[PDB]
Amino acid sequence: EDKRAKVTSAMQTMLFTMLRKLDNDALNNIINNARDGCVPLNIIPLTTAAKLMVVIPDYNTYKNTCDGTTFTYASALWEIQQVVDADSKIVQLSEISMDNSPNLAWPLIVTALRA
Amino acid sequence: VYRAFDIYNDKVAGFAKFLKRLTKYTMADLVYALRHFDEGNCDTLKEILVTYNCCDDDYFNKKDWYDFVENPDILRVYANLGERVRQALLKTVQFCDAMRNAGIVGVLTLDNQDLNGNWYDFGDFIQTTPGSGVPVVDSYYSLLMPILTLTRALTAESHVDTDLTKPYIKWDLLKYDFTEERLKLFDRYFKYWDQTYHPNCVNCLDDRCILHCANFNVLFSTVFPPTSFGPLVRKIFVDGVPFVVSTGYHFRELGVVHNQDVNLSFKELLVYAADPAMHAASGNLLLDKRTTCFSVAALTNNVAFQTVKPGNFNKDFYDFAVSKGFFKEGSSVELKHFFFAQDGNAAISDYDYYRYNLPTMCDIRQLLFVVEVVDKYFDCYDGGCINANQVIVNNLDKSAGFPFNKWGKARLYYDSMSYEDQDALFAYTKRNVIPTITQMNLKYAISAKNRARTVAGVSICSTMTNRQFHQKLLKSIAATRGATVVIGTSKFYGGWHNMLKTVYSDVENPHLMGWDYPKCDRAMPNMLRIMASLVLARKHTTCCSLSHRFYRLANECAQVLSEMVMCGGSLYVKPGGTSSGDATTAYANSVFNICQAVTANVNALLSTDGNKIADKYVRNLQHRLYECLYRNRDVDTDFVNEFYAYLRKHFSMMILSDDAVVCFNSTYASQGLVASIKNFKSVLYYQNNVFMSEAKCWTETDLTKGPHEFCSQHTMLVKQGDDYVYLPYPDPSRILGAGCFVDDIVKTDGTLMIERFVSLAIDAYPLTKHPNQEYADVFHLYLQYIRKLHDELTDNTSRYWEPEFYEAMYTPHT
Amino acid sequence: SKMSDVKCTSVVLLSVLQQLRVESSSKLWAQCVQLHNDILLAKDTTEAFEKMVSLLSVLLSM
RNA sequence: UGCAUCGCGUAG
RNA sequence: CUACGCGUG
Ligand SMILES: [Zn+2]
Ligand SMILES: [Zn+2]
């Protein structure tokens, strides 16, 4: 009863918080473009996410995917904003290199913003 | 020499090898080689591969080249043949057209089409009215279906103009309805398949129609983009606020499904929170190059890496064992079981093993006959739907899943929702599909392998509703003794002996057999999981309608088969397989095991020459089996019963989820009338897409010795009160490791340790009757340690260090 | 016998290293876990002793 | 920090 | 029988 009310309040708060985290400038575009109004869930983060997080296992994948300060993924251009390591330390772009790769705590989590 | 032939006539029938411009090998040769695969005899497959430039002979010099797990590159080699297969299929249609125009009625056989696609058979063709010719293509397409998925024959359909050289087709990301594309593919490839095909399984007549349509959808979905599948979502306005909510689901097997109670309370709050729509919408995009699986989004600002801690060491017990003479140099009993720590990349790596789940099309006629036969193994049990008041939950302090774990345990949600609310949720699940998220959690357990173990904690709603759906049948199976499925049958108080006597029942030349399913959960096809769910739901004939049962199947497929998996704060799409935390984990696995066994038997019988069989009864049985498989659509109940009796007589089985013991007639197996280990290997190859190594399978010639291994316990025949009994003794290393190494430190020592050592002694007592003396001394060591623990802690406790208490547990009184 | 005691020493050593917050650093933890797992699966005593010496060196350095 | 099954121990 | 704790796929 009381705990039931607590659970209801918590779920409502979480949903409205995710709504605050939600933006409609991008969403309403796809909603109106869609004849049905129904869209696959997977495409929502692809075409509406402001931030992209890329997990890199090794240096070869880094070079193959997003080597430069700006890269292209999901038919969109992203600019790198941060490159943390497995220890959540701010690795700098210069440190990433075939020479210094053994001294970097792979995997590398790169966070970029949509251009 | 010997060539594969598909034959049907009054005298003989079946698909087997016979001694009987054009290419050297036919399509029947390829189908036989890929469906009857034996590593020792692959010459035909090797020659077909090298002749048509799928691989070079050097490829064969490598060992484990055939195994998918060790050498996944074989998938590429086979794929190099796919186009040929496709261009054979497209030629077949043309031939059929010609015949229809020529008023010719005949049966099309695989052994009459060369690997170039040309049809050179003009026999059995009887002229009729022009335009009235009708070909029989059941056997051809049915036998060729398994090869289509392995060779990835329809890959050309993923390219512009159906040409591999040209670029890929760019489908609109927002598109999700491929009904017209499926109809076009069916009319282009399977045009003369007279059975009606439904792209959306919501419009299926019965469970068999669902299986057929899903068998075709498995093949057709590979062509379509990978982002169309999954929860269909829509923006709606509730309380003057915009919520993105799920209003449907696109299934690689079941097509598009739309919720019937879509509109724009604790129940609605749970359905909202469980839905991955909100989480994926509020999550940042994620690209994960550590896996080959699809990545949805990241619900966390930072990635999470979880580690497995090292197991604790109990110094007192190990020192006691050393002082009492155990763990010496060269002793047979040694510590081979420990807690293996893991790095931060462990969890995700385990998830990456789902890479071994491949799209698998099944021989639909074979699967239909096999499900009909398998339903016989579940007739005794009773099933149906129950209400909330009749549901039993063993532990209410477990995890509720994501995002429910954030606020409380399962007890919280079971207490908050009244029985009426749970019944309302169940009824909603009978009309609408609720997609859910399952967390992947690494397990802390003892083992003899460095590999880590991951389990899937499903959300609270899935457990609640699947329980209300299946618990009656599940408890019925757990309360039945003397059946093929031995869930609920204890090994104590003579249970082992009773079970073993049940399995040995009336086999003329009894031999014993056992096997292992390589990567069962990860590599299990989705079609077989759907078939298991349908067999488990066939007990709802009276309480559920067709639509209700289909929507329950859709819920199961969207909450287990192809769910969304949170691994370290990041959502991923599961390619398929079976979850380990669903309500029907063990029983669905038992259904799958029985299905594989019946399939092996059916393949063994048909693969026999038939003319050689000197028994009229088995020859007629083979003929009628071919008839009921590739010539009769409607189920023949009498022959299903006869085949079930045949298998029970010559192929007695004992099944726990993945472990199986079999007592079979050795003479029939030698003559090919019943399945052998090679047949199981071939079936696991062409169906389960895994190679079974003969090392992990065992065959026992002497019934007296008993099963080599079942449920990780061995069998010993020992004399108790003038009567011999089969008793289960465990590997001593496991018990000693459980005694020495503990997961946490609270249990390392104290009064609680006495209970653990009493239980380990209960498990170890059967070792006292082993001829090896050390195995017996293990139990006395445990007893002495229990006594010493009581002494250090310091009448009743006497029974714990006196062996009569443990001897009683293995006697048939109770 | 020396092999079983080497295995148990490796177990307790990795437990101490875990309680030393070595898992905070990813690569050190990876090295220690690999060494310990190989020790537990080692069938020859000399290689197990070498890996145990390496783990003890890891502990001693800090 | 999953779904089951079986067996123990202590209390009502 | 109920609650709690401990010990195969
Ligand atoms: Zn249908
Ligand atoms: Zn029902």
Author numbering:
A (entry chain B): 77 to 191
B (entry chain A): 31 to 50, 118 to 361, 367 to 896, 910 to 929
C (entry chain C): 1 to 62
Give verbatim lines from the article.
Coronaviruses use an RdRp enzyme to carry out replication and transcription of their RNA genome. For RNA-dependent RNA elongation, the 3ʹ-terminal nucleotide of the RNA product chain resides in the –1 site and the incoming nucleoside triphosphate (NTP) substrate binds to the adjacent +1 site. Catalytic nucleotide incorporation then triggers RNA translocation and liberates the +1 site for binding of the next incoming nucleoside triphosphate (NTP).
We prepared RNA scaffolds containing RMP at positions –3 or –4 by annealing short RMP-containing oligonuclotides to long, loop-forming RNAs (scaffolds 1 and 2, respectively). The first RdRp-RNA structure (structure 1) was resolved at 3.1 Å resolution and showed that the RMP was located at position –3 of the RNA product strand, as expected from the design of scaffold 1.
